[PDB]
Amino acid sequence: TCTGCVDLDELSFEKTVERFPYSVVKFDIAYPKGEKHEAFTAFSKSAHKATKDLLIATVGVKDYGELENKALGDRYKVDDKNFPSIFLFKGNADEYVQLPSHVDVTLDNLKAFVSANTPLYIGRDGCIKEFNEVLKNYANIPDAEQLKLIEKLQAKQEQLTDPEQQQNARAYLIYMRKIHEVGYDFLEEETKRLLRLKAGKVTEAKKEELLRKLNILEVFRVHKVTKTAPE
């Protein structure tokens, strides 16, 4: 019944799914043991760390005795002969997305199932998904495109709500502006400064703020430098 996973049944399923904006629910046997269960469990804990908007829930389905949650199982066409079945909801118990059954049940595919199908994001502390989406090969894009992204992400920064999140966004833009100004050498430089900071006397909170900056700086790395300038 994994840590953090709310255990749901026929009277409570729909009412609870529909009070959350997003829900990921595992249908499975009653009393799951195994690697597929241990990964859900691991995903439960990681999810709880990254968000407050996401229900992580479980439905245990029986057929000895009084077949608990058989009805509920059928409501979702779940293959009793092929558990775990994993579903994502968006606040409507009538409309769901199913992890295809050929996908392995790992931490990382569970996170990718969520990122691909919602606004939400389960990854490294300090990151902001709508910012990562526009930022792939930032380092290599033309000067004019780079600045138009600055306009854009500055738009997004202005309307941001969480203290923390406002601050994640100031780091993104500081880095976007420096790479634009100085080029790709700013990564090696900033990385060296932050790690040295983190090798100092710091409070856990300062530590965690230093990991968010290194996490964000990480988004700007490119496999190959493809822009150069001049002499």
Side-chain angles (χ1 to χ4, degrees), residues 1-9 11-14 16-34 37 39-48 50-51 53-63 65 67 69 71-76 78-80 83-94 96-123 125-129 131-132 135 137-144 146-147 149-151 153 155 157-158 160-166 168-169 171-187 190-197 199-200 202-205 208-222 225-226 228-230:
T1 160
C2 55
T3 305
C5 299
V6 343
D7 217 8
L8 290 186
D9 75 1
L11 300 184
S12 79
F13 187 83
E14 177 185 300
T16 314
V17 154
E18 312 199 325
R19 270 292 160 193
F20 289 75
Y22 301 110
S23 312
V24 178
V25 170
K26 183 158 75 61
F27 282 70
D28 198 352
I29 53 170
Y31 308 115
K33 290 92 195 358
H37 188 63
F40 200 65
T41 289
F43 163 67
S44 176
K45 313 204 200 105
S46 158
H48 281 295
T51 185
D53 274 351
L54 176 66
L55 183 69
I56 317 300
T58 56
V59 177
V61 178
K62 228 164 221 256
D63 30 299
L67 332 105
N69 297 313
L72 196 54
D74 302 353
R75 211 201 140 212
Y76 293 92
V78 310
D79 196 13
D80 30 307
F83 278 128
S85 290
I86 300 185
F87 302 83
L88 175 147
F89 297 85
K90 310 206 194 31
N92 190 348
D94 295 359
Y96 64 89
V97 85
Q98 190 157 343
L99 174 79
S101 66
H102 71 258
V103 183
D104 249 316
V105 193
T106 50
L107 224 195
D108 262 48
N109 294 327
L110 266 333
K111 297 193 199 187
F113 181 50
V114 174
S115 38
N117 285 286
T118 64
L120 292 192
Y121 170 82
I122 316 184
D125 207 3
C127 290
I128 301 164
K129 201 213 237 179
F131 277 44
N132 307 358
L135 288 182
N137 261 213
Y138 181 78
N140 283 323
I141 90 202
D143 262 27
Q146 277 182 336
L147 280 168
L149 291 193
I150 292 170
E151 308 166 317
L153 295 196
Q157 206 208 332
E158 273 108 50
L160 275 170
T161 319
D162 153 65
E164 220 166 270
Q165 205 84 133
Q166 283 156 315
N168 301 334
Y172 272 96
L173 277 305
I174 283 155
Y175 297 160
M176 277 168 85
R177 291 171 165 295
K178 278 304 284 200
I179 286 165
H180 176 99
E181 189 219 339
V182 177
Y184 196 77
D185 322 50
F186 174 80
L187 264 298
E190 200 48 4
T191 299
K192 306 194 211 275
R193 195 194 65 105
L194 296 155
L195 287 176
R196 185 69 186 176
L197 292 184
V202 280
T203 57
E204 291 290 338
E208 295 172 7
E209 189 212 341
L210 298 170
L211 314 155
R212 306 190 291 267
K213 301 209 187 132
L214 288 156
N215 283 330
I216 300 186
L217 183 75
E218 180 76 32
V219 168
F220 290 85
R221 281 199 218 258
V222 290
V225 288
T226 246
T228 6

